[PDB]
Amino acid sequence: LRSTPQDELHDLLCVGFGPASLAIAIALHDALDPRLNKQPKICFLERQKQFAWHSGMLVPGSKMQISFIKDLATLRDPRSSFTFLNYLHQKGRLIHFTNLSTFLPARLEFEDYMRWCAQQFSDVVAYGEEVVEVIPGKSDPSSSVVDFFTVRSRNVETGEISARRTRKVVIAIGGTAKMPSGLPQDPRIIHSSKYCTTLPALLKDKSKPYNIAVLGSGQSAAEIFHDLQKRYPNSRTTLIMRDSAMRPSDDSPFVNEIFNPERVDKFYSQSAAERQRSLLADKATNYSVVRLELIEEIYNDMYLQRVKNPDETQWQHRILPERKITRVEHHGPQSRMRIHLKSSKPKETLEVDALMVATGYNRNAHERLLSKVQHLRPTGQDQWKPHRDYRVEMDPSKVSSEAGIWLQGCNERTHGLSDSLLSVLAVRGGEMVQSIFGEQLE
Amino acid sequence: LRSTPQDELHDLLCVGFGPASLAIAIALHDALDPRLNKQPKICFLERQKQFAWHSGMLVPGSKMQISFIKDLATLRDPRSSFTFLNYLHQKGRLIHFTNLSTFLPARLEFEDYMRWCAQQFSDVVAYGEEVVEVIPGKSSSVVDFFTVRSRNVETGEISARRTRKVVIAIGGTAKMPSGLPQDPRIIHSSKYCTTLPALLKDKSKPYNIAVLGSGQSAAEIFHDLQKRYPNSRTTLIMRDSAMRPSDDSPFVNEIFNPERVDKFYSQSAAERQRSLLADKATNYSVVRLELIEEIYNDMYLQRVKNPDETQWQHRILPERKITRVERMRIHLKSSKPKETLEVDALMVATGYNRNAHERLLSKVQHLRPTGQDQWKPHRDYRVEMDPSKVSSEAGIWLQGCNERTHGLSDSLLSVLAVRGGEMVQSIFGEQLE
Amino acid sequence: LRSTPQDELHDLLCVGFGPASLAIAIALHDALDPRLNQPKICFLERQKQFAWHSGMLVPGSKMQISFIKDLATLRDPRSSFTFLNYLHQKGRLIHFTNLSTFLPARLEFEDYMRWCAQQFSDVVAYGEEVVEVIPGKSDPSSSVVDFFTVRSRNVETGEISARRTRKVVIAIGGTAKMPSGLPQDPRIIHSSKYCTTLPALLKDKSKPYNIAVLGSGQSAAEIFHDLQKRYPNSRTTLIMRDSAMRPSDDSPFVNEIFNPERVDKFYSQSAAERQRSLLADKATNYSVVRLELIEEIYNDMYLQRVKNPDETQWQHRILPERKITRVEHHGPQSRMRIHLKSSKKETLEVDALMVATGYNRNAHERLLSKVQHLRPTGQDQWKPHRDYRVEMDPSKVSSEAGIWLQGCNERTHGLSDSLLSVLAVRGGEMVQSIFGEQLE
Amino acid sequence: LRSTPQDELHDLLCVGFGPASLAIAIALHDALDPRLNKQPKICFLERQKQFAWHSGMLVPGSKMQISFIKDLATLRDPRSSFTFLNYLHQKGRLIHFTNLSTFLPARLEFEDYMRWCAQQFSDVVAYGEEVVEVIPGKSDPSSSVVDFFTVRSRNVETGEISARRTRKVVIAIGGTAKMPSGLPQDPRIIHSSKYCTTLPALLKDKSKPYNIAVLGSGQSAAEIFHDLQKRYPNSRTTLIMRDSAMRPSDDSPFVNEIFNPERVDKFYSQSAAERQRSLLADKATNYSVVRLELIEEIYNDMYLQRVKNPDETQWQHRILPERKITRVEHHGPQSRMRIHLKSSKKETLEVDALMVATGYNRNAHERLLSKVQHLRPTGQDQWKPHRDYRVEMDPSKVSSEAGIWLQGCNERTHGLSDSLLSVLAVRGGEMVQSIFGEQLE
Ligand SMILES: Cc1cc2c(cc1C)N(C[C@H](O)[C@H](O)[C@H](O)COP(=O)(O)OP(=O)(O)OC[C@H]1O[C@@H](n3cnc4c(N)ncnc43)[C@H](O)[C@@H]1O)c1[nH]c(=O)[nH]c(=O)c1N2
Ligand SMILES: Cc1cc2c(cc1C)N(C[C@H](O)[C@H](O)[C@H](O)COP(=O)(O)OP(=O)(O)OC[C@H]1O[C@@H](n3cnc4c(N)ncnc43)[C@H](O)[C@@H]1O)c1[nH]c(=O)[nH]c(=O)c1N2
Ligand SMILES: Cc1cc2c(cc1C)N(C[C@H](O)[C@H](O)[C@H](O)COP(=O)(O)OP(=O)(O)OC[C@H]1O[C@@H](n3cnc4c(N)ncnc43)[C@H](O)[C@@H]1O)c1[nH]c(=O)[nH]c(=O)c1N2
Ligand SMILES: Cc1cc2c(cc1C)N(C[C@H](O)[C@H](O)[C@H](O)COP(=O)(O)OP(=O)(O)OC[C@H]1O[C@@H](n3cnc4c(N)ncnc43)[C@H](O)[C@@H]1O)c1[nH]c(=O)[nH]c(=O)c1N2
Ligand SMILES: NCCC[C@H](N)C(=O)O
Ligand SMILES: NCCC[C@H](N)C(=O)O
Ligand SMILES: NCCC[C@H](N)C(=O)O
C-alpha cells in the first residue's frame, strides 16, 4: 500500500494498528492484487512506537488459544501472501513447525508473525500517534451537512497535535485495563496488561524472597501465577480468586461454532435479549476461564507441595479461593502492602511486594474518542449503533452518504463473542473492504 | 454376612440393592473383619430379580465417567477385598487392565465389578421384591420399630418384615416431559438397551428415530443408534444450542471429595443452591469431551459427502422443543423464549427425579416434627423424627436423594466407599462397641 | 495446462498419474503462474479416472502425515493446490478447523487429490497401461538415441498406441507383494484389493464368516479392525510373524529424516551408511501401526476378556509368532484350511484370507527392459542421480533425452521417497531439472 | 519382621536393600500374615546409610515410567498394606492423587512410598554395610559338602569388618555405572547416577554461564540436558549422541506384555538364540529411549530458539547427533576441558563438566561371589540361575539346604522386566516360596 500525503483528504483513516486494523490492511492489499481478485488513500494511526501485540503478557511459554488457521488471511483466502503458513515458509521454518504437531503457536511466535505482517504496511502507518478526537467537517459552504471528519492525534514523543482529514473513520483500539474499583493506585499494584514490561523494573532481584499476590481466576491470572514461580524461584506467591476454583475454557467443537465467520449474520439479526442470553450461556468460551493444560500443571505443582508438606498453610505457593479484597494498605516507606481478605460470599492478611491484577478489560474507549461527533447520531441515542457491516448510524440529514465511522473490536454485544478476538478477523477485513471501498474499486 | 430369619426383628433393613446399599453392606463386612478393624441383623430388599446397574444404558462402548479409584471401598480402605483392583486380580485380569492405561473402565466391566461384590451378600438380599410401604410399629404411643411391606414381582404376594432402622436407597425414577403421551415407541433412556431392540427388530430397516436431550445419555444413544441401525435416519433434538463438555478439571472436581460433605452440609440453603448451580457442568446436561468430538467427526464426514446439512442421514436439531406428538408425528418449535418429524421411535434422555421415598414413607411422615412438608436429613443422613413420637433406638436414613443437603456427589459413586463407612458407624456404631 | 496432439514429439511423458506425478503437474502449473514466479507434457494412467489406493479407503481410516505435507504447501503455501485451499473452495475450511486434527480421513484426502487431478484432465490419458519404453533415433546417420517411444495398452479396447517424447518419468508406485508359497485362489486377496474385491467374494454382511488377515502392519490392523464392523458376526483371525503390533514413529527429532532438505544429505552418503540409516528408522514406516489404532484394537480384545476369560473362545483373535505351513483350497468346500506352525499345531478354516504384506517397487525394470542396454557398461540396475535422472551412456544417449524415476528410489534418496512427504518440493525440483533451461 | 541376633545361623541374608530386596521383605511379611494366607531368620545388608532410590537422578519433574499398579505388592495381592494406593491413604493424599489422573507419579513421590515401605523393616536391615565377599562354609569337618555361607561386610563409617552366617544368600545389588572406555577420569566427568548429588558441588554458582555437556541419547541424558537448562539458566548445554535422534520409549499395549509377570515362564524356556533375538527386537521398550513427552518438550525448546535466531550454531543449548568423542584434554589449571568430536560414520567443545548418561552393567555379582565360584558345575564361566533365580551349584559340593539366588541381574535369562519394578511384586512372592516355602509348611 502506497502512502498518502498527511494533509490530503483520505478515503479511510483507521484508529489503532492492532490485528483488527492489520486485517483490514491485508484485505485491502489482497483486494488490490489482480492475482487474488477479479488505490484508496488510507492511513493508520497507532499510539505504540512500533507494532507490538500485548507485550505486557508475552509470558515465557504462553501459547495461543486459537488454531493458526484462524490467522489474518487464511479463512478469507489461503492463497494470500499473509497466511501464517506462508510466513513460516518465508522464514525457512515451515517444515520445523510441522513437526511441532500443534495448532497453537507460542504467543511470542504469533506476535512475530503479526510483526512480519505489519512491517509490510509501514508506509501507511504512523506510530507514536495517540488519537484524541474526531471532529466533524463540512466541505461545502451551502450545506450544514457533515461530509468529512478531522482526526486529531497527539504524538507520544513530541506532544505535538496533528490533524488529518478523512471521509471515513475506523475505530479499532481494543481494550483498556479493567481494575476493581476498590483497589487504590500504587506502583506495586500492576494490571496484567503491564506484567512483563513493568514488574521486572519493580522487583529487580530474581532471587529475593518476594511476596507477590495475583488477583483473578482467568487465563491471565493463571499464567501470571505460574510464571512468577519460575521468574522469581524463591518467592511466596498467592492466587486470590472470587470463584471457588479455576475453571476450564471451552473450545469443544459444537460450542466453538459460535466463532465461525458465517454466524455473525445470525447472531446480529437475533433480538437483544436473545443475544445477551446467548453470550451468557457461552461465557465459558472466553471469560474467567483457564486452559485445562494450565489448570493441570498448576494442580500438579500444588500436589508436589502436598507430598513435601501436608500442611497447606506452609506451602510456598498457595491458592486462596472464594476471597475478596476488602482493603489494601499502601502508605509509608515500607517495601510491602497489607492486603485484607474476606470471603466472597454474599479474617486474614497478606503482606506482598506487588499485587498483579488480572481482571480483564473494558471496550468503551470509542465513546470518549467520538464525543465531539456524537451529536450526529439519530435523535435519542445514548450509545453508538453499528449496522451488520459495522458502520454506526448517523442522522442522514446531518451526514453525507459518502462519510461514515465504523467500529471494530468493541461490538461483542451486537456481533458475537468473536468480535474482540482474531476468530473472524480475516473475513471481517474482507467485508470491511467491501463496505468502505466497494464502489470505489468497482 | 449371614442371613437373619425373615420373621425376626431386624437391626437394619435397606430398601434397594444398588451401589449405595452395596457399599453399606461392604463397609459392614469390613467393620466385622479383624484384619481391618482390631453381628448385626441386616437384610436387603431389591425389586430387580438379580443385581444390575442401569441395564437399560449398558450401551456398547460406554465408559465410566469416574476414576476406578472411586469404587465401593478404596477411598475408605485400600486394603479391602472389595476394591476394583482386587476384583480384577481375582478375575486374572489385573495385568491386562494395567496396560489399558485408563482410569475409566467400560460400564459393562464396572457393572461386573459390582455384580461380583453383590454376590458375596446373596444371603441377606431378597431379589424380586418391590417395597411398597413403611408402616410404624409400637412394641404406649412411642414408635420403636417399622414394618416394611414388599410385593413379590413373581407371585404378587405381599410379604412383611419388621426392623428397628430403615435405609431408603432407591436411586431415581425416570423424569419425563409432561406433554409426551403414552405409547410403546416413546422410551426413557433407562430402558434403552432392554426395550428398544424388542420394538425395532430388523437392524437393516430405514427407521426414523429421534433422541430427546443433550446430556451424556442422549449423546450415547444418538451415537449408538447410528451403529446399531446403519441405514436409519436419526435426529438428536436439543433445547440447547450445543452439547457441552463435562467438567472434571482437578480443582473443580474437589467438590466430590469425601471430606467436602462436612463443609457443604453446614452451608446455608442459599450457599448450597448457588454452589450447585455454578458446578452444574460437572454432572448435568453435559457430555464427555471425547464423545462430543467423536460425534463431531461423524457429522464432519457427512459434510464431506454432502455440504447441505439438511440432507444428512443423521442430524442434530439445536434450540428446539417438542410441542406435540401425534409412525408418530413430532412437531417442533424454536426453544427460545413449523417443523415435523415422522419417527418409528422416540428416545427420551431427560434424566431422573429422586423423590420416590416420599410416597414410600407417606404413612410415617406424621412422625416428623410439626410443620414439615419435606423429610429433613441430618448430616449423618438420619431424618428428623419427633422425639416424643419415635424412640431414639428407631430412625430412618436416606441415601442418594440428598444432593440438596450433601452435595453433587450424593447420587454418584464418588463418596460411596466413605459414606458406607459413616453409615455403618451411624447405624451399627454403638452395637459394635 | 493445454493438451498436446498425441502424434507430436513431447518434451515430457510421465507414466502414471498418482500423487508423485500429480505433484509434477501442479509444480509445472505453478512455475508458469505469474503470481507465483508451455512445455508439451502428457500423463498416462492405467486407472480409468484418478484414484488413490481405493482398495484401502477403509471407513474411518486416517492419514498418517500432516495435511501441511500436501501436494503444494511445502513448496509454496500460496499455491491454489493446497489442502487448505481445497477446503476453502468446498466451503469446509471452518468446519475442518474445529476438527483440531492434522490427519484428515483418507477418503477426504483422496477427494482433495481428485479435486487437484481434475484440473489436469486435458494432459492425462486415462485407461492407458504403459507396457514398454522403446528407443528412438531421429537421424538415420546417427546411432545416438534422442527420444523414447512409450507404448500403452488401452484397458477397455486392448488397442496399443505409441507416443514419442524426449524425456520420460516413471512414477508407477508399487506392486502387491505376496508371500511365496501362498497359492493363487480368489479367496486369497492382497490388501490393495480389499474394498474393491472382498465384498464381491463375501456378499452377506451378516453371515458368520471366518476371515483371516496376514501381517502386522498398518493395513493389517485396519483390515482386522474394519472386518469386525463390516461383518459383525464374523470370526476374524490376525496372523502375524511378529510377537506384537508395533507403533509407528513420528516423534519430532526422528521425523526429520522426512524433511525435504534431508534428501541432499541422505543421498550424498555411502551405501553402507544409507543402508544402515534406513534400517535404524524402520519404525517410521514399515510393519508399524498407528498407536491409536493399536490401542483401539487392544480395547476390543480386553472387552472380550471381560466377557469370556478363555481366549480360545473369542470371536476375534490375534495369533502372534505364527507362520503358514500349508493352504488347502481345492475341493467343493467354501472354506480353505490354513495350516499354521509357530514362527520361532493349528488349523483355521477360513472363507477368505486377506494378505497385508506390502509392496515391491521394482516394476520399472520390466517397463525399461528395452532401453536397459543404454545404461553404462556393467550396470545391473538403474542408477538415479540426485535429481532422479538415471545414468545413460553418453555415447549412446543424447544429452537432450533422459528418463527419471519417482517413488522407487528409497535406497538412494531416503524413506520419504515413496510417501507424500517430499512430493511438493520434489515436484518443483523435477520441473527445474526437466524444464528449467527451457523456461529461461 | 522380627530381627535375628547377628551371631546366629540365618535362613536368608540379602545383599542390598533396594526395590528388589524390599519386595521380598514385603512378600515375606504378607506370607506370614494370617490375614492374607492360610518366623524365618532374615537380615538385609545395605551399603547406603538409609534407604534411597537412585537419588542422584531424582530430577525435579521426573516421572515414573511404569504404572503405579506395578508397585511392590499390588500385582501379587492388591489387599497388601504395602500398595501405593494404601501408602497415599496413610499419608492422607489418596483423593488428591486421584484428581491428578495419572498412572505415573513423580520420581520424588514414588521414592517416598518405598521409604515408607522400607522403614517398616528397619529391624532387619543393617545400613552403611558394604558386603565384600561370600565365603563357603562347612558345618561338618568330616563331610566335604558346603551347607552355609559367611557374608562379610565392611562398614562404610568405621571400616570394621562384620561376618554373618546364613544357609541362603540373595544378591540384589542393582547396577554399576557403565562408562565409555575412551573417556578419562576427571572430577568434571560425572556419571548420571551422581548428577543431583555431585554436580552442584562442582558447579556451585547457578548463575554463571557454564558450558556443560551431556553424553547420551536415552532417558537419563534427556532428563539431565533438560534439567541443566533450568538449573543453570545462563549455561550453554550440549547433548552429544551417537544416534541421529532421540527415540521414544515403547509401552504400547501389545508390545508391553513382555513385562507381564506370567511371561517370565515362557521367556525363560526359550533357547538362548530366541532370547537374544527377543531382547533385540524389543529394545525400544527400555534402552536408549526417552519418554515421548520429554522428547516433545525438548523439541519445543529447540524450536523456540529457532524462532529467536534461525542459525542453529549460535543457540544457547544445542544437540550434536551422530557424534563420538575422540579425545578429552583435562590437564592444567584451565577450568574447562576440551572435548574433541568426530562424526560417528575437527570439532571441539570447552566444558566445565561432562555428564555421562551411558547406563549400567550388572555384573557386580561375579566379583562378590569369587570365593564361591568353584562350587559351580564344570565348564561354566558364568553363574546360571534357574527359573526360580537360584544359581546352579555342583550338587556334590553344596548341600541342598544351601544356595545362592540372584535378583535384578538376570535379564539375559528372565526378560527385560528383570532389572525394573515390573514384576517385583510377583517375583517377591516366588522368592519367598522358593526360599522359605518348605520352612513355612
Ligand atoms: C494476553 C492476551 C492474550 C490473548 C488475547 C488478549 C490478551 C490481552 N486475545 C484477544 C485479543 O483481543 C485479540 O487477540 C486481538 O488483540 C484483538 O485485536 P484488536 O485489534 O480488536 O485490538 P488490540 O488491543 O489488539 O490492538 C488495538 C490497538 O489499538 C491501539 N490504540 C489504542 N488507543 C489508540 C489511540 N487513541 N490512537 C491510536 N491507536 C490506539 C493500541 O495500541 C493497539 O495497538 C486473544 N484472541 C484470540 O482470538 N486468540 C488468543 O490466543 C488470544 N490471546
Ligand atoms: C446411565 C447412567 C450412567 C451413570 C450413572 C447413572 C446412569 C443412569 N451414574 C450415577 C448413578 O446414579 C450412580 O452411579 C448409582 O447408580 C447410584 O446408586 P444408588 O444405588 O443410590 O441408585 P440406583 O438407581 O443405583 O440403585 C437403586 C436400586 O434400588 C432399586 N429400587 C428402586 N425402588 C425400589 C423399591 N421400591 N423396592 C426395592 N428396590 C428398589 C433399584 O432397582 C436399584 O437397584 C454414574 N455415577 C458415577 O459416580 N460415575 C458414572 O460414570 C456414572 N454413570
Ligand atoms: C493403504 C495405503 C495408505 C497410505 C499409503 C499407501 C497405501 C497403499 N501411502 C504411501 C503411498 O506410496 C503414497 O501416499 C503415494 O501414493 C505415492 O504416490 P506414488 O504416485 O509415488 O504412486 P502410487 O502407488 O500412488 O500411484 C502410482 C500410479 O501409477 C499408475 N501406474 C502404475 N503402473 C502403471 C502402468 N504400468 N501404466 C500406466 N499407469 C501405471 C497407477 O495406476 C497409480 O495410480 C501414504 N503416503 C503418505 O505420505 N502418508 C500416508 O498416510 C500414506 N498412507
Ligand atoms: C534414574 C532411574 C530411573 C528408573 C530406574 C533406574 C534409574 C537409574 N528404573 C530401573 C531400576 O533399576 C529399578 O527401578 C529398581 O532400582 C530395581 O531395583 P534393584 O533392587 O535391582 O536395585 P537398585 O539398582 O534399585 O538398587 C540396588 C541396591 O543395592 C545396594 N547395594 C549395591 N551393592 C551393595 C553392596 N556391595 N553391599 C550392600 N548393598 C549394596 C545399593 O545401595 C542399592 O540400594 C525404573 N524401573 C521401573 O520399573 N520404572 C521406572 O520408571 C524406572 N525408573
Ligand atoms: N479465547 C480464544 C477463543 C478462540 C475461539 N475458540 C475460536 O476458535 O475462534
Ligand atoms: N507413512 C507416514 C510417513 C510420514 C512421515 N512421518 C512424515 O512426517 O513425513
Ligand atoms: N523402563 C520402564 C519400563 C516399564 C515397562 N514398560 C512396564 O510396563 O513395566
In short:
With 442 residues, chain A is an alpha/beta fold.
Tell me the layout of helices and strands.
4 copies of one chain form a homotetramer.
Chain A: E1 9-10, E2 12-15, H1 19-31, E3 42-46, H2 84-90, H3 94-98, H4 107-119, E4 125-127, E5 129-137, E6 148-155, E7 161-166, E8 168-171, E9 176-177, E10 189-191, H5 195-202, E11 211-215, H6 219-231, E12 236-240, H7 263-269, H8 272-281, H9 292-308, E13 317-320, E14 323-329, E15 337-343, E16 348-352, E17 354-357, E18 361-362, H10 365-369, E19 404-407, H11 412-415, H12 425-441
Parallel strand pairs in A: 1-7, 2-3, 2-8, 3-4, 8-19, 10-17, 11-12, 11-17, 12-13
Antiparallel strand pairs in A: 5-6, 6-7, 9-18, 14-15, 15-16
The complex binds dihydroflavine-adenine dinucleotide (4 copies) and L-ornithine (ORN) (3 copies).
Residues 64-65, 69, 250, 255, 258, 284-285, 419, 421 of chain C line the site of one L-ornithine.
- End-to-end separation of chain A in angstroms reads 18 Å
Strand content of chain A: 15-25%
Task: Specify Rg of chain A, calculated over alpha carbons.
Answer: 24 Å
**Can you tell me the number of structural domains of chain A?**
1
Strand elements of chain A, count: 19
Spatial order of the strands forming the largest sheet of chain A:
4-3-2-8-19
Distinct ligands: dihydroflavine-adenine dinucleotide, L-ornithine
The major β-sheet of chain A equals: 5 strands, parallel
Biggest chain contact:
A-C, 31 and 30 residues
The amount of helix of chain A comes to 25-40%
What's the helix count of chain A?
Answer: 12
Assembly type: homotetramer
